[PDB]
Design a protein around this nucleic acid. Sequence first.
DNA 1: CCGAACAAGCATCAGC
DNA 2: GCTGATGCTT
DNA 3: TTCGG
Length: 326
Amino acid sequence: TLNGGITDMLTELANFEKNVSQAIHKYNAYRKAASVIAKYPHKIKSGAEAKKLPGVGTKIAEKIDEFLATGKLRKLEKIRQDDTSSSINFLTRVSGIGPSAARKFVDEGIKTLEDLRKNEDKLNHHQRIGLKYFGDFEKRIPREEMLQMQDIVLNEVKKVDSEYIATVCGSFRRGAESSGDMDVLLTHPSFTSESTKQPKLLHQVVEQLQKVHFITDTLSKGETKFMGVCQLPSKNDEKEYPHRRIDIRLIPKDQYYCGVLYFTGSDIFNKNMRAHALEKGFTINEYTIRPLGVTGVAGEPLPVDSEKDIFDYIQWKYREPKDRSE
DNA sequence: CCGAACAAGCATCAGC
DNA sequence: GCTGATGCTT
DNA sequence: TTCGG
Ligand SMILES: Nc1nc2c(ncn2[C@H]2C[C@H](O)[C@@H](COP(=O)(O)OP(=O)(O)[C@H](F)P(=O)(O)O)O2)c(=O)[nH]1
Ligand SMILES: [Cl-]
Ligand SMILES: [Cl-]
Ligand SMILES: [Cl-]
Ligand SMILES: [Mg+2]
Ligand SMILES: [Mg+2]
Ligand code: NA
Ligand code: NA
Ligand code: NA
């Protein structure tokens, strides 16, 4: 956190542009600059020094100069005073409330936690569960708790069918000492890119985790992606653990490496890697890497036998998960 | 100067 | 119902 | 907002 004041400022600007201005490219620009500055191994002395990094341009350099000189940014001082911006930023902290619904709620006079709680009938299902667990979802998960959760998920999945493989990805797989949620990649040999030989593969796992009261709520659920809520069991007289967000993603078994690369992230790492792929003439998603043809149409999937094969195609040296926390 | 900026699953809605 | 756009999310 | 052609 050599430059934590700068990166906090840029993150706050990113969130303003996403939530309030609905300016996605400014949001991405600020997050990318925060990320590249976060990895920079010197304490930054000037905007000009920062502008040498890719993703930091003229406007962010000027803001860095203001922040170094004064410890603050007038632009943010003013945003913090703006009631509509304050209301919108608060509302978007509820899972399922994005920039559009937040602004609509404000128009309707719904702008505080109390307002939301008395207007549950104006929320869709996702938003209602997001409100229910508003406090819990902003708490971090100690890696010690992530390990207990991993043990439950892996053992319960095994009881449904010993041929499932569940892999915990996200920041956990990158070795983080705490995580914001739990991300689980799931495979089963019945589900490949060529055929689905058994129905309900994801449903059966969700069902088992609900049966043992690990999964407590559902935000969304389809054939390949579950987004929901879980909770560790507590012992006698113990206060309960916070409820936690859990995402489960069933991926074709032959596409595990693209899937685990995607689900390990970070999100900015993936954006950077995919952007580099495009510059190299490839496109990467969670299933495949394919060349781009003469006109920019993706060709056929390329053979992939390891995470490293994907890095090789785009002429990147391999990066272990712990070095992808961008 | 100016076009591109990662890629996609699920929920929800409008239009036919 | 189906299709496609949009919102929200990973 | 930044980058690259
Ligand atoms: N290509 C692409 N991939 C994305 C995106 N968002 C998330 N992902 C992928 C990478 C995450 O690690 C992974 C899990 O998504 P996540 O939001 O749980 O992130 P994470 O890396 O686990 C955070 F550090 P934590 O949850 O601990 O707070 O999903 C995205 O916008 N684009
Ligand atoms: Cl924008
Ligand atoms: Cl500030
Ligand atoms: Cl594909
Ligand atoms: Mg996560
Ligand atoms: Mg570019
Ligand atoms: Na730069
Ligand atoms: Na939100
Ligand atoms: Na997640």
